[PDB]
PDB file of C-alpha atoms in Angstrom:
ATOM      1  CA  UNK A   1      -7.709 -21.200  22.976  1.00 35.09           C
ATOM      2  CA  UNK A   2      -5.975 -18.170  24.446  1.00 38.24           C
ATOM      3  CA  UNK A   3      -3.141 -15.795  23.823  1.00 40.71           C
ATOM      4  CA  UNK A   4      -0.772 -17.918  26.014  1.00 40.52           C
ATOM      5  CA  UNK A   5      -1.490 -21.063  23.826  1.00 40.15           C
ATOM      6  CA  UNK A   6      -0.876 -19.118  20.615  1.00 40.71           C
ATOM      7  CA  UNK A   7       2.463 -17.717  21.869  1.00 41.97           C
ATOM      8  CA  UNK A   8       3.647 -21.118  22.921  1.00 42.30           C
ATOM      9  CA  UNK A   9       2.600 -22.669  19.563  1.00 45.02           C
ATOM     10  CA  UNK A  10       4.551 -19.972  17.635  1.00 45.10           C
ATOM     11  CA  UNK A  11       7.459 -20.293  20.065  1.00 43.51           C
ATOM     12  CA  UNK A  12       7.539 -24.025  19.436  1.00 41.47           C
ATOM     13  CA  UNK A  13       7.322 -23.599  15.687  1.00 38.71           C
ATOM     14  CA  UNK A  14      10.131 -21.028  15.615  1.00 38.39           C
ATOM     15  CA  UNK A  15      12.307 -23.147  17.873  1.00 39.78           C
ATOM     16  CA  UNK A  16      11.736 -26.057  15.547  1.00 37.81           C
ATOM     17  CA  UNK A  17      13.061 -24.074  12.533  1.00 38.25           C
ATOM     18  CA  UNK A  18      16.274 -23.063  14.298  1.00 38.96           C
ATOM     19  CA  UNK A  19      16.963 -26.265  16.132  1.00 36.82           C
ATOM     20  CA  UNK A  20      16.291 -28.622  13.266  1.00 38.11           C
ATOM     21  CA  UNK A  21      19.898 -29.632  12.598  1.00 38.53           C
ATOM     22  CA  UNK A  22      18.962 -31.530   9.441  1.00 39.13           C
ATOM     23  CA  UNK A  23      17.447 -28.472   7.840  1.00 42.70           C
ATOM     24  CA  UNK A  24      20.313 -26.236   8.977  1.00 44.50           C
ATOM     25  CA  UNK A  25      22.833 -28.621   7.371  1.00 46.48           C
ATOM     26  CA  UNK A  26      20.894 -28.826   4.117  1.00 45.64           C
ATOM     27  CA  UNK A  27      20.737 -25.022   4.092  1.00 45.49           C
ATOM     28  CA  UNK A  28      24.505 -24.819   4.613  1.00 47.11           C
ATOM     29  CA  UNK A  29      25.108 -27.574   2.041  1.00 49.18           C
ATOM     30  CA  UNK A  30      23.571 -25.452  -0.782  1.00 49.98           C
ATOM     31  CA  UNK A  31      26.010 -22.752  -1.733  1.00 48.93           C
ATOM     32  CA  UNK A  32      27.547 -19.318  -0.842  1.00 50.14           C
ATOM     33  CA  UNK A  33      29.063 -18.222  -4.149  1.00 53.58           C
ATOM     34  CA  UNK A  34      25.870 -16.923  -5.876  1.00 52.91           C
ATOM     35  CA  UNK A  35      22.747 -16.713  -3.709  1.00 52.42           C
ATOM     36  CA  UNK A  36      20.531 -15.539  -6.617  1.00 52.01           C
ATOM     37  CA  UNK A  37      20.966 -18.846  -8.520  1.00 48.59           C
ATOM     38  CA  UNK A  38      20.392 -20.898  -5.402  1.00 49.00           C
ATOM     39  CA  UNK A  39      17.222 -19.058  -4.531  1.00 48.54           C
ATOM     40  CA  UNK A  40      15.527 -19.598  -7.912  1.00 49.16           C
ATOM     41  CA  UNK A  41      16.532 -23.225  -8.078  1.00 45.54           C
ATOM     42  CA  UNK A  42      15.226 -24.014  -4.586  1.00 43.93           C
ATOM     43  CA  UNK A  43      12.057 -21.909  -5.278  1.00 42.02           C
ATOM     44  CA  UNK A  44      11.322 -23.744  -8.543  1.00 42.56           C
ATOM     45  CA  UNK A  45      11.478 -27.198  -6.834  1.00 40.04           C
ATOM     46  CA  UNK A  46       9.422 -26.082  -3.917  1.00 44.99           C
ATOM     47  CA  UNK A  47       6.574 -24.907  -6.192  1.00 44.71           C
ATOM     48  CA  UNK A  48       6.873 -27.397  -8.968  1.00 44.67           C
ATOM     49  CA  UNK A  49       3.590 -28.883  -7.806  1.00 43.92           C
ATOM     50  CA  UNK A  50       1.845 -25.561  -8.363  1.00 47.50           C
ATOM     51  CA  UNK A  51       0.821 -25.023  -4.731  1.00 46.28           C
ATOM     52  CA  UNK A  52       1.726 -21.482  -3.675  1.00 47.33           C
ATOM     53  CA  UNK A  53       0.380 -21.468  -0.090  1.00 47.16           C
ATOM     54  CA  UNK A  54       1.460 -18.881   2.466  1.00 45.82           C
ATOM     55  CA  UNK A  55       3.227 -21.441   4.679  1.00 48.96           C
ATOM     56  CA  UNK A  56       5.600 -22.503   1.852  1.00 51.07           C
ATOM     57  CA  UNK A  57       6.345 -18.931   0.928  1.00 49.88           C
ATOM     58  CA  UNK A  58       7.355 -18.131   4.486  1.00 46.74           C
ATOM     59  CA  UNK A  59       9.584 -21.264   4.449  1.00 45.87           C
ATOM     60  CA  UNK A  60      11.155 -19.836   1.322  1.00 44.51           C
ATOM     61  CA  UNK A  61      11.643 -16.426   3.031  1.00 44.64           C
ATOM     62  CA  UNK A  62      13.341 -18.161   5.961  1.00 43.77           C
ATOM     63  CA  UNK A  63      15.626 -19.953   3.510  1.00 47.14           C
ATOM     64  CA  UNK A  64      16.505 -16.751   1.617  1.00 47.98           C
ATOM     65  CA  UNK A  65      17.251 -14.943   4.935  1.00 48.77           C
ATOM     66  CA  UNK A  66      19.870 -17.633   5.879  1.00 47.62           C
ATOM     67  CA  UNK A  67      21.317 -17.315   2.346  1.00 48.47           C
ATOM     68  CA  UNK A  68      21.880 -13.472   2.482  1.00 47.21           C
ATOM     69  CA  UNK A  69      22.602 -13.117   6.201  1.00 45.69           C
TER      70      UNK A  69
ATOM     71  CA  UNK B   1      20.906 -31.951  -3.657  1.00 46.29           C
ATOM     72  CA  UNK B   2      18.707 -28.890  -3.906  1.00 46.96           C
ATOM     73  CA  UNK B   3      15.813 -31.346  -3.992  1.00 48.18           C
ATOM     74  CA  UNK B   4      16.101 -32.583  -0.436  1.00 46.04           C
ATOM     75  CA  UNK B   5      16.177 -28.985   0.736  1.00 45.45           C
ATOM     76  CA  UNK B   6      13.237 -27.854  -1.384  1.00 45.38           C
ATOM     77  CA  UNK B   7      11.279 -30.919  -0.156  1.00 44.98           C
ATOM     78  CA  UNK B   8      12.251 -30.087   3.368  1.00 42.10           C
ATOM     79  CA  UNK B   9      11.074 -26.496   3.057  1.00 41.93           C
ATOM     80  CA  UNK B  10       7.866 -27.496   1.231  1.00 39.67           C
ATOM     81  CA  UNK B  11       7.058 -29.898   4.145  1.00 39.41           C
ATOM     82  CA  UNK B  12       7.647 -27.213   6.767  1.00 38.51           C
ATOM     83  CA  UNK B  13       5.389 -24.725   4.940  1.00 38.22           C
ATOM     84  CA  UNK B  14       2.641 -27.274   4.476  1.00 35.71           C
ATOM     85  CA  UNK B  15       2.773 -28.151   8.178  1.00 36.34           C
ATOM     86  CA  UNK B  16       2.360 -24.492   9.229  1.00 33.50           C
ATOM     87  CA  UNK B  17      -0.777 -24.226   7.015  1.00 32.07           C
ATOM     88  CA  UNK B  18      -2.176 -27.591   8.214  1.00 31.09           C
ATOM     89  CA  UNK B  19      -1.667 -26.683  11.908  1.00 27.17           C
ATOM     90  CA  UNK B  20      -5.346 -26.410  12.563  1.00 28.32           C
ATOM     91  CA  UNK B  21      -4.962 -25.440  16.193  1.00 27.89           C
ATOM     92  CA  UNK B  22      -2.619 -22.685  15.105  1.00 26.22           C
ATOM     93  CA  UNK B  23      -4.891 -21.510  12.234  1.00 24.61           C
ATOM     94  CA  UNK B  24      -7.916 -21.706  14.606  1.00 26.15           C
ATOM     95  CA  UNK B  25      -6.371 -19.562  17.407  1.00 27.47           C
ATOM     96  CA  UNK B  26      -5.161 -17.038  14.798  1.00 25.05           C
ATOM     97  CA  UNK B  27      -8.598 -16.833  13.228  1.00 26.34           C
ATOM     98  CA  UNK B  28     -10.046 -16.055  16.662  1.00 26.46           C
ATOM     99  CA  UNK B  29      -8.435 -12.629  16.796  1.00 24.19           C
ATOM    100  CA  UNK B  30     -11.506 -10.397  16.298  1.00 23.68           C
ATOM    101  CA  UNK B  31      -9.942  -7.520  18.217  1.00 20.85           C
ATOM    102  CA  UNK B  32     -10.368  -3.749  18.085  1.00 20.81           C
ATOM    103  CA  UNK B  33      -6.591  -3.571  18.568  1.00 24.58           C
ATOM    104  CA  UNK B  34      -4.382  -5.993  16.616  1.00 22.98           C
ATOM    105  CA  UNK B  35      -1.323  -4.154  17.994  1.00 22.45           C
ATOM    106  CA  UNK B  36      -2.003  -5.260  21.581  1.00 20.83           C
ATOM    107  CA  UNK B  37      -2.509  -8.827  20.442  1.00 27.05           C
ATOM    108  CA  UNK B  38       0.763  -8.693  18.472  1.00 28.59           C
ATOM    109  CA  UNK B  39       2.774  -7.296  21.381  1.00 26.71           C
ATOM    110  CA  UNK B  40       1.129  -9.688  23.842  1.00 27.25           C
ATOM    111  CA  UNK B  41       2.112 -12.775  21.769  1.00 24.74           C
ATOM    112  CA  UNK B  42       5.574 -11.467  20.888  1.00 25.04           C
ATOM    113  CA  UNK B  43       6.266 -10.760  24.585  1.00 27.20           C
ATOM    114  CA  UNK B  44       5.355 -14.346  25.588  1.00 25.70           C
ATOM    115  CA  UNK B  45       7.410 -15.790  22.651  1.00 21.81           C
ATOM    116  CA  UNK B  46      10.554 -14.044  23.925  1.00 20.79           C
ATOM    117  CA  UNK B  47       9.961 -14.132  27.654  1.00 21.52           C
ATOM    118  CA  UNK B  48      13.082 -16.356  28.125  1.00 21.53           C
ATOM    119  CA  UNK B  49      15.524 -13.917  26.489  1.00 19.23           C
ATOM    120  CA  UNK B  50      16.366 -15.775  23.233  1.00 16.41           C
ATOM    121  CA  UNK B  51      15.627 -13.602  20.253  1.00 16.83           C
ATOM    122  CA  UNK B  52      16.262 -16.176  17.615  1.00 15.24           C
ATOM    123  CA  UNK B  53      15.439 -15.752  13.998  1.00 16.34           C
ATOM    124  CA  UNK B  54      13.119 -18.761  13.853  1.00 14.30           C
ATOM    125  CA  UNK B  55      10.842 -17.284  16.438  1.00 14.61           C
ATOM    126  CA  UNK B  56      10.815 -13.987  14.534  1.00 16.29           C
ATOM    127  CA  UNK B  57       9.805 -15.747  11.336  1.00 22.04           C
ATOM    128  CA  UNK B  58       6.957 -17.496  13.106  1.00 18.22           C
ATOM    129  CA  UNK B  59       5.929 -14.146  14.631  1.00 18.00           C
ATOM    130  CA  UNK B  60       6.081 -12.769  11.051  1.00 14.98           C
ATOM    131  CA  UNK B  61       3.886 -15.581   9.842  1.00 18.22           C
ATOM    132  CA  UNK B  62       1.383 -14.708  12.601  1.00 19.64           C
ATOM    133  CA  UNK B  63       1.599 -10.925  11.960  1.00 18.59           C
ATOM    134  CA  UNK B  64       0.930 -11.324   8.238  1.00 20.57           C
ATOM    135  CA  UNK B  65      -2.276 -13.242   8.873  1.00 19.90           C
ATOM    136  CA  UNK B  66      -3.185 -10.855  11.710  1.00 17.32           C
ATOM    137  CA  UNK B  67      -2.766  -7.641   9.639  1.00 13.86           C
ATOM    138  CA  UNK B  68      -3.838  -8.844   6.194  1.00 14.62           C
ATOM    139  CA  UNK B  69      -7.318  -9.496   7.544  1.00 15.59           C
ATOM    140  CA  UNK B  70      -9.346  -6.214   7.268  1.00 16.77           C
TER     141      UNK B  70
END
């Protein structure tokens, strides 16, 4: 427990997002014609179990960022 | 197709929320000044020089839990 430990945990997590080549490839393999359709399709499957927890929403926000930027 | 990605993202989000160590350290921020905590953690996260989007999203995950507790 400390501010150092928290920063390293977040640093580790963020670095896991960007360096996960499998995720990056799946994200690139989706589409680039019409992001709106891709977003709602991915969102529907992510939440088909009904669980709308904050971690998943942030994952979806990361995905949308890569789609529009 | 879209399924493997959605499953991948769902797993990442559930892992964030089940990171008990992470949830526990974040819950310990009973500070008079959230701003200082925010800048302190953000400074350590970027002390190398790499301002990559993944770290920013994790900082955004942290900041949301930090600020939306009041």
